[PDB]
Design an enzyme around this catalytic site. Structure first.
Site, mmCIF file in Angstrom:
data_model
loop_
_atom_site.group_PDB
_atom_site.id
_atom_site.type_symbol
_atom_site.label_atom_id
_atom_site.label_comp_id
_atom_site.label_asym_id
_atom_site.label_seq_id
_atom_site.Cartn_x
_atom_site.Cartn_y
_atom_site.Cartn_z
ATOM 1 N N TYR C 105 11.468 77.457 56.301
ATOM 2 C CA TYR C 105 10.270 77.173 55.470
ATOM 3 C C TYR C 105 9.921 75.687 55.594
ATOM 4 O O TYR C 105 10.822 74.872 55.741
ATOM 5 C CB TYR C 105 10.536 77.423 53.972
ATOM 6 C CG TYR C 105 10.429 78.843 53.510
ATOM 7 C CD1 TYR C 105 11.535 79.680 53.595
ATOM 8 C CD2 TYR C 105 9.231 79.376 53.021
ATOM 9 C CE1 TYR C 105 11.505 80.982 53.154
ATOM 10 C CE2 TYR C 105 9.160 80.711 52.593
ATOM 11 C CZ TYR C 105 10.291 81.499 52.694
ATOM 12 O OH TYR C 105 10.342 82.803 52.275
ATOM 13 N N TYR C 144 16.259 85.162 56.761
ATOM 14 C CA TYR C 144 16.994 83.876 56.527
ATOM 15 C C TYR C 144 18.167 84.121 55.595
ATOM 16 O O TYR C 144 18.165 85.037 54.765
ATOM 17 C CB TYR C 144 16.094 82.726 56.204
ATOM 18 C CG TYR C 144 15.256 82.967 54.951
ATOM 19 C CD1 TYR C 144 15.801 82.739 53.684
ATOM 20 C CD2 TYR C 144 13.947 83.389 55.052
ATOM 21 C CE1 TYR C 144 15.050 82.955 52.524
ATOM 22 C CE2 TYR C 144 13.162 83.631 53.916
ATOM 23 C CZ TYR C 144 13.719 83.418 52.657
ATOM 24 O OH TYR C 144 12.917 83.620 51.554
ATOM 25 N N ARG C 154 17.945 87.433 53.702
ATOM 26 C CA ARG C 154 16.645 87.973 53.191
ATOM 27 C C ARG C 154 16.007 88.696 54.419
ATOM 28 O O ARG C 154 16.007 88.165 55.523
ATOM 29 C CB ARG C 154 15.764 86.871 52.705
ATOM 30 C CG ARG C 154 16.053 86.137 51.395
ATOM 31 C CD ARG C 154 16.296 86.987 50.227
ATOM 32 N NE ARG C 154 15.407 88.087 49.995
ATOM 33 C CZ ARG C 154 14.115 88.171 49.733
ATOM 34 N NH1 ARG C 154 13.214 87.162 49.641
ATOM 35 N NH2 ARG C 154 13.675 89.411 49.421
ATOM 36 N N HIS C 157 9.984 88.549 55.134
ATOM 37 C CA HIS C 157 8.995 88.894 54.083
ATOM 38 C C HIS C 157 7.879 87.838 53.995
ATOM 39 O O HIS C 157 8.081 86.738 54.481
ATOM 40 C CB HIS C 157 9.696 88.848 52.662
ATOM 41 C CG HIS C 157 10.406 87.563 52.426
ATOM 42 N ND1 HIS C 157 11.717 87.356 52.880
ATOM 43 C CD2 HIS C 157 10.055 86.429 51.767
ATOM 44 C CE1 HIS C 157 12.107 86.141 52.538
ATOM 45 N NE2 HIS C 157 11.188 85.568 51.876
ATOM 46 N N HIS C 159 5.354 86.065 51.048
ATOM 47 C CA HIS C 159 5.250 85.978 49.534
ATOM 48 C C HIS C 159 3.768 86.164 49.186
ATOM 49 O O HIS C 159 2.949 85.589 49.922
ATOM 50 C CB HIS C 159 5.793 84.672 48.956
ATOM 51 C CG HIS C 159 7.287 84.545 49.033
ATOM 52 N ND1 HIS C 159 8.147 84.778 48.008
ATOM 53 C CD2 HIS C 159 8.080 84.151 50.096
ATOM 54 C CE1 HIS C 159 9.407 84.553 48.390
ATOM 55 N NE2 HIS C 159 9.393 84.145 49.629
HETATM 56 O O1 LIG Z 1 16.460 82.867 44.939
HETATM 57 C C1 LIG Z 1 16.966 82.726 46.059
HETATM 58 O O2 LIG Z 1 17.613 81.671 46.403
HETATM 59 C C2 LIG Z 1 16.727 83.726 47.225
HETATM 60 C C3 LIG Z 1 15.350 83.534 47.841
HETATM 61 C C4 LIG Z 1 15.121 82.503 48.766
HETATM 62 C C5 LIG Z 1 13.809 82.313 49.234
HETATM 63 C C6 LIG Z 1 12.780 83.142 48.825
HETATM 64 O O3 LIG Z 1 11.540 82.900 49.376
HETATM 65 C C7 LIG Z 1 12.980 84.186 47.911
HETATM 66 C C8 LIG Z 1 14.254 84.329 47.354
HETATM 67 FE FE LIG Z 2 11.091 83.765 50.969
#
Ligand SMILES: O=C(O)Cc1ccc(O)cc1
Ligand SMILES: [Fe+3]
Ligand SMILES: O=C(O)Cc1ccc(O)cc1
Ligand SMILES: O=C(O)Cc1ccc(O)cc1
Ligand SMILES: O=C(O)Cc1ccc(O)cc1
Ligand SMILES: [Fe+3]
Ligand SMILES: [Fe+3]
Lengths: 233, 200, 233, 200, 233, 200, 200
Positions: C105, C144, C154, C157, C159
């Site tokens: 990211y 990731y 993960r 995905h 967001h």
């Molecule tokens: O909450 C976490 O650390 C896991 C997570 C990391 C990135 C994200 O975009 C969503 C959840």
């Molecule tokens: Fe994420």
């Protein structure tokens, strides 16, 4: 020099893709129209090169370093090479090639609009160990469009070539990734009539082999023609 | 019946096979040690020869993206399996066709005679495997020499081809390149004069 | 100014993930222990901002140009935004954010070893059309690793945040890709108890919308709380 | 019973929400028009105030990755839904907590009174939604002002909280920052003095 | 000294019993409320003691002679210790303890009314052989009541402790006996969410290993975490 | 995905663990060789120390039936894996809590520094695994020394705990017992001051 | 993946297609308005031309029951979609093969150049769709003009055909008929000189 000491189980040409599979366009003009001629196995067919003495570089099998770090999903691709009798095939040559994370190959002829990765070549080689295992470290390749039907896409794949103990066992194939929605639509995958055979080309996610906080791993085992001793010949 | 594990299914090598197996050809940097088209070092025993050929599709069009592997005995009819770049002679090699010219070349010696399983001698030949986009599973063939009619006539393998006219497709025609001994072996995948392909 | 003219169907808190889902570690300390207090809807809850007049740039929704071309699988992500009654939600704000093809990211706090893409930002926004449709063009994100269990990953995905017609409809979620083997293993995905609900977060490959020889496409439709007129109040 | 289509399930905004909704905060370049923490222009009618607060987890630790959205009436108790950067006042805004300090700030005016559905006036309040890694579905709450006890006492919403002690959690304490009128509103997600959260 | 050359497959904490299992009353105040903190494996975690040089007595594994003959069902308890890859774990310490035939433990704190057996102790130890095999000779224990619910009874069991190759593999468990109807009623068993996990704890009657006219035999195999070499680390 | 054989599930050690692993404590006769709480012989190199502690449940009550196993490097930062009663130093030991006092004791030496996988040295620590009735699967923790603050500050492991306050739960308080160096390490299973537990 | 409603499957037009789409040819009375083979009125701008051709099957025999539909730009490179018998030019027409001679004819004008999607101009061409008994789904092809070689050379579409030799199959041979400009476009469905057919 080599000696004629084994026989290989006959190939199943109904398991493997046939030569003429029309949906795969280029195969129309590149498939023989006469039947293959079967010939009994001789020293000519039952022997092959041994690459035990080839001088491999230290990162021959590491695509993350063999060409900055490339962009893309870090993964290890590992598995075992056995024969149809379940016997390991040690010291055998495994070669691979693939596109980048965008589906772009480092080849003249690749004009796809996805850019080249300054730090990615996409060629690897590994000699299997005493137990038939191999491993590579690379990035997961991206699907790519090709001029077949008006909207055909190759599912992400890694190209593999495997020597085995003889020229009779040599094989070139393609590994696909567990769950890719593009597999069932690909005319090349579909060149294989048996759905069960297709399953054999699918690499399984292997969390057991992944490096936490580093890279994922996929498991792809390879099965070459079974090898047996001659008898009552 | 008893069923073994199924062999992994073949898949076309595709149009970019070169990046993986013919680096130079791909026009990419090579590695220290590469498996290529020179089986014999100047100093290797036997008649040194040059092999060249073209590959044709069913429309009679040149196949400019083919990849070929070869396996042959040494001048003594011995198969040298321990591949090494230090070897004066290696029984295995690789070649490919030009994207332009569409011609492959190989530098070797003329293979010695080897016997089949029944103890009968086969005529001198080079085992060839061909790969390319559009070929789901590689094609197996053999290269024989026009200057060995006598042996060719008695080859137990060549004798397995039903129609004599088909046998001719497997005979390389002797020529000379730069006053060097050469043999031309054209492969025709489909149609008129379709090359004989084996299953073993 | 806004007026109190509608009511929104009560949320199903058994459909949505609960607050405390222990496998998702951070949720332990970030979940309330007292019960939420239900309150009747008023103008305060039944109204919300309208972004019709926000000045969006020309490539706000195009991640391939909004930041050279990025490396990775070119894809279009499109769909429709409707309410529980099947009614389109026009002129609504859809915002998205994601990692690069390697799962990195563009944020200070991201220390994952996968490199940043010099040509990738990963932020997009689009106002839905008169028919509730939206579309974005980006590259497919890489999975990731994260510090939860000793080897958690993960699934790739994107967001999403969606405004809707009121603050009562606002929602933030995550879109996953059809077939990703990582979905069933993710403790965050698993924060959702009903398997049927999970299906709702899976983007489907949409070959109909892809641009031959260019990019693939995924379809992700969004459903917001149903909107109705007050009656006998 | 009649069942509608199911609403899309919520998912945590995660630790990187800022790249998507708090660009500056992410420490990335912003776009021409960004939705942020200044609801009122100097010239907007009403008492201009500054809101600040911290967010605490169940262990009493600061949550430094929170994202908050706010909705309030204007000084006249009117909800200004047509969001525009040219507006002297916008009813909607966004803020987030410092990765360092862990404090959020918002620049607005004191909201006018609005009536509930039954026609009863509610005390001045700011509707808040909170998002963060570890929160599967956002938390809804309201900010009320300590200097409006009279109204607070009669708020029909505030009156719905069973225990009077819980009502106190929703009252911002008036202060002054640089001789400017401010109100501090700390949110406690869990445990001691846990902030009241709504469902609607 | 020990060296760091192995990595162990991450434990599956949804497979093993969770910490808080309320029906098992004592777990209430003896289970952490904060999430475990996952750490990468280091030499600290991938090494462990080897008990090869421990001087074991002649009857260490024979509960019939290590303390007259005990009263009870003479039995042999044997099996193998393998890792998740199916590899044997040779020279590993296996310790066991149980009650006598009446469910009475030879411990100060056990005031159950069933009498102690003068010829019975209830403790054994065995080092696995080269093949990962261990064996014990004992008498089958009896179930016993415990103050949990008002009428809770533990099914007959033998407590086991296995070292394995590292502190990461060390485990303690209970072996239960095939067909005991108390099994499914036990809150301790029930701490295990997955019925397939429960099955793993049940020893099978093994007539093949029995000594005719003498003692019966039960088979109990144990699986420690899979051990793999490090790679691309 | 690839699935291996599942690990045998853990089960509480139960109240009578002592009978199997702490004979003396169970108040039963011991065998010739027992694995106990004396890791080092008087003549073992390194600073000899006395470690003691108590274990508390979530109600703040003493756990008088706990069983502990320890793993540590010797003074040189080396793990002595070959367990032998003749050795002057054993990297492995066992201890348990008094049914009375409810305190455990261990006789060892201050462990030398070892590096992590990345080659980054970890502060001197002792690996502990706790077992007891009520604990379905054992708890893993580490004991650090209060007089090693510099090192503790740089520990790659200690540095993994997000909240600085929780790190203090892993630090043993130096003391003297009979003018002998000691360190007290209290473990709180749950609630206030809850000890950090690890997974790996 | 997303699946739409499936398109209604195609079926051969069959031997009697004429009755429905080529009344004159079917030898049945026509209606007032029929869509036929005269695209341009004598007074339509552009070079008026006569197009004729025959269709052959795989045995080299005449297909005397073929039905063709054409689509082309006018002289200005514009597609006139509003079909009207009064127009001096219609972008759409229909023709069929004589049951006797087996030749089709069309009266139009040389189409102007239009650009592809990428804005790259295509050489003047006529879009053809062929129907007939034996053809399960219609065949799509394009007719190019021999006197437009420069343009043909740069055609983005013609340039898509891999083999240069196959491109020639799309080029109509200019001629004169009654001292009137004509171009002959023969279509070979299969075998030697097989006409290129398209998919889109
Ligand atoms: O909450 C976490 O650390 C896991 C997570 C990391 C990135 C994200 O975009 C969503 C959840
Ligand atoms: Fe994420
Ligand atoms: O033959 C083709 O053109 C399709 C294809 C492209 C690349 C590849 O690697 C395999 C097959
Ligand atoms: O935890 C308990 O008290 C029940 C129990 C009793 C004995 C035993 O061996 C195991 C668990
Ligand atoms: O092709 C044929 O001859 C069969 C057929 C006959 C009439 C018809 O309308 C359709 C197909
Ligand atoms: Fe490919
Ligand atoms: Fe017990």
């Amino acid at each position: 020099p080599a000696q004629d000491n084994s026989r290989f189980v006959i190939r199943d040409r109904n398991w493997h893709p046939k030569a003429l599979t029309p949906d795969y366009k280029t195969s129309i003009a590149r498939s023989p129209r006469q039947a293959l001629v079967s010939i009994p196995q001789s020293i000519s067919e039952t022997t092959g090169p041994n690459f035990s003495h080839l001088g491999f570089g230290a990162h021959d099998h590491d695509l993350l370093l063999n060409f900055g770090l490339p962009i893309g999903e870090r993964i290890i691709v590992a598995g075992r090479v056995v024969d149809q009798y379940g016997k390991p095939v040690p010291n055998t040559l495994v070669e691979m090639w693939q596109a980048n994370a965008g589906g772009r190959y480092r080849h003249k002829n690749d004009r796809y609009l996805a850019p080249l990765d300054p730090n990615f070549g996409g060629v690897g080689r590994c000699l299997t160990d005493s137990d038939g295992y191999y491993s590579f470290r690379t990035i997961k390749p991206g699907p790519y469009p090709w001029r077949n039907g008006p909207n055909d896409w190759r599912p992400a794949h890694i190209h593999f070539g495997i020597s085995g103990p003889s020229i009779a066992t040599k094989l070139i194939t393609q590994l696909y990734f567990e769950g890719d929605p593009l597999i069932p639509m690909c005319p090349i995958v579909k060149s294989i009539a048996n759905p069960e055979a297709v399953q054999q080309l699918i690499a399984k996610l292997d969390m057991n082999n992944a490096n936490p906080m580093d890279c994922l791993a996929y498991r792809f085992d390879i099965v070459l023609r079974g090898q047996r001793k001659t008898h009552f010949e | 019946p008893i069923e073994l594990l199924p062999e992994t299914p073949s898949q076309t090598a595709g149009p970019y096979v070169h990046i993986g197996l013919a680096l130079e050809a791909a026009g990419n940097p090579t590695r220290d040690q590469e498996i290529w088209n020179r089986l014999a070092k100047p100093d290797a025993p036997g008649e040194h020869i040059l092999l060249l050929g073209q590959v044709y599709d069913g429309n009679g069009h040149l196949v400019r993206d083919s990849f070929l592997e070869v396996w042959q005995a040494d001048a003594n009819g011995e198969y040298q399996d321990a591949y090494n770049l230090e070897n004066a002679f290696n029984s295995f090699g690789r070649t490919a066709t030009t994207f332009d010219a569409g011609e492959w070349t190989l530098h070797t010696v003329k293979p010695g005679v080897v016997n089949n399983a029944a103890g009968v001698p086969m005529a001198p030949h080079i085992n060839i495997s061909l790969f390319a986009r559009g070929i789901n599973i590689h094609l197996h063939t053999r290269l024989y020499f026009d200057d060995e009619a006598q042996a060719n006539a008695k080859c137990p393998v060549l004798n397995l081809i039903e129609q004599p006219q088909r046998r001719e497709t497997l005979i390389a025609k002797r020529c000379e390149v730069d006053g060097k001994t050469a043999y031309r072996f054209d492969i025709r995948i489909q149609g008129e004069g379709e090359t004989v392909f084996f299953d073993f």
